[PDB]
A paper describes a structure:
Additionally, the C-terminal region plays an important role in regulating RNA translation by directly binding to viral RNAs and cellular mRNAs. Here, we present the three-dimensional structure of the Gemin5 C-terminal region, which adopts a homodecamer architecture comprised of a dimer of pentamers. By structural analysis, mutagenesis, and RNA-binding assays, we find that the intact pentamer/decamer is critical for the Gemin5 C-terminal region to bind cognate RNA ligands and to regulate mRNA translation.
To understand the mechanism underlying G5C self-assembly, we solved the structure of G5C by cryo-EM at an overall resolution of 3.31 Å based on the gold-standard Fourier shell correlation (FSC) curve. Consistent with the result from the SLS experiment, G5C forms a homodecamer with an MW of ~750 kDa. Consistent with the previously solved TPR dimer structure, A–E forms homodimers with A’–E’. Several basic residues of TPRB, including R1035, K1061, K1062, and R1090, are spatially close to RBS1C around the unstructured region between helices α26C and α27C.
Numbering used by the authors:
A (entry chain A): 847 to 876, 884 to 1132, 1155 to 1240
B (entry chain B): 847 to 876, 884 to 972
Write the structure that this text describes.
Amino acid sequence: SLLPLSTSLDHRSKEELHQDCLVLATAKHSSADVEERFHLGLFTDRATLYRMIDIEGKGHLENGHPELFHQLMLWKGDLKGVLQTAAERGELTDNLVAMAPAAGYHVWLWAVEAFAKQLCFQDQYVKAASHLLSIHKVYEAVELLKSNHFYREAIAIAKARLRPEDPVLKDLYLSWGTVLERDGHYAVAAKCYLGATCAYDAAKVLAKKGDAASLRTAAELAAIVGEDELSASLALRCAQELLLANNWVGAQEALQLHESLQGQRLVFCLLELLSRHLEPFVERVTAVWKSIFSLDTPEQYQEAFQKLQNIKYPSATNNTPAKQLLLHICHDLTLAVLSQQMASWDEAVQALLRAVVRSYDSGSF
Amino acid sequence: SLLPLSTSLDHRSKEELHQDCLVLATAKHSSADVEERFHLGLFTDRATLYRMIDIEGKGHLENGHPELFHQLMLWKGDLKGVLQTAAERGELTDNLVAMAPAAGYHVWLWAVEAFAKQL
C-alpha cells in the first residue's frame, strides 16, 4: 500500500522479528545497530522514522507513485520544500496544490502559478487558464488561451470577466474571424464580425463564399445591418449567379428585396422570355410587365428607363460563355423596348443595333 | 471536448449557419428568437452566454464529467456556489479545492474540512 517496504520487511521469519525486538530493547535503554533496520524508527525515536520515511520516499520511484512521495513530506512537515522541489522535476499536481495554502497564501499563489506552466506543456491550457482565473489574473487567462489556439473559451472567459465595452474582447473576435478566413468557414467568420459590433465586413465575408445562397444571405444580412446599397449590390450579384442551373423566378423574387433593382427585374423577365423562346414579342413583353410586375403607366415608364441607361457592360468579346452574353443582349433589348415609346425611335433603333452588334461580335449565330 | 454541444450545433449545414448569422444581426441591432439558439450568447451579450454555459453544465451529466461541470462556474465566477453545492452531492474533489482559497481563506478551510468527510 502506502509503505510496501515496511509491510514487506515486517512479516519476516519469527526469529527476525525477535531480533528486531531485541535490537529495539537495546536501543531504547541507553547505537549503530538500529541504523541497519530503519523501520524501528516507528518505535525508537523521532530522528529515525524521518530516515525511514526518506528511505520509503526514495523507494517510491520504482512503482511510479510520486503522489505518496510528495505526501510523505507532509507527514514530515516540510511542505515548503516538497512544493518547491515538485515544480523543478515537473511533478507538481492538483493534489499537492490542494495543501498549498497550508504553509501560506503566497505559497499557494506560487504553487498555482508554477502548476500553470506544467499544465501549459501538458496540453492543459484550459485548466491553466482557469487557474490564472483563480488568482483573478483575468487578462492573462485569455492571452495564453488564444495563443494556444482556443478562441471560444477565451471569448467566453473575457465576456464573463470584462464588461462589454472592454477593448480586449473585440480583438479576440477579429483575430478568430481572421483565422477563420483562411479556413473557408465564412459563415462563422461573419458571426464573429457581427459580434465584434462591426458588421460592415460581415456581409463581405459572407459574400466571399461565392454560392448563390451565400450571396443572398449576405444581401439580407447587409440589409439588416443598414447597408442598403451594399445589400442592393449583393442582390444584383446573386441574381446572375442564381440563373445557372434552373432558377429564374427565385432570382426574380430575390431581386425584390430592395427597391432599386426594378430595371434588373424587368431585364431578367426578358431573360426568362428569351430562354423560353428557345423551346408579338415586343407587345407580349410589356403585357407581362403590366401583369406580373404591376407597372402600367407612362409616368414611371421613363424613370424606370433612365436608371437602366446609366449602366454600361464590357465589350463582350468572343471568349465568354453564352449566359452573360445573352443577359447583356436581353438588357439592351429591354432598353430598346423601353425607349421605343415615350421618346423618339432613335434611341430604340440605336439600342437594337447595339444588341445585335453585341450578339454578332461574340461569334454567336 | 469541453463544449461538445457547441461544436456539435456549430458545424451544421451552411443554411443553418446563415440563419444563425441573420438572427445574431437581428438581435444585436435593436428578442425571443435568440432564446432558441443559446450558442449566440457567445456573441450576443453577457446575459445569454451565462444561460448557454448553464445548458452545457446540465448537459455535462450524460458524459460523466463533473470536473468540467464545476469548472464552468469558475468561468461564470460563482466559485462559492459551486463549492457549496459540490459537497452536498458528494462531488467535491482535489481539483475544486485547488481554487478553494481563491474566494477566501475560510472558504478553503470549509472546502478541505468537507472534502475530509467524502474521503
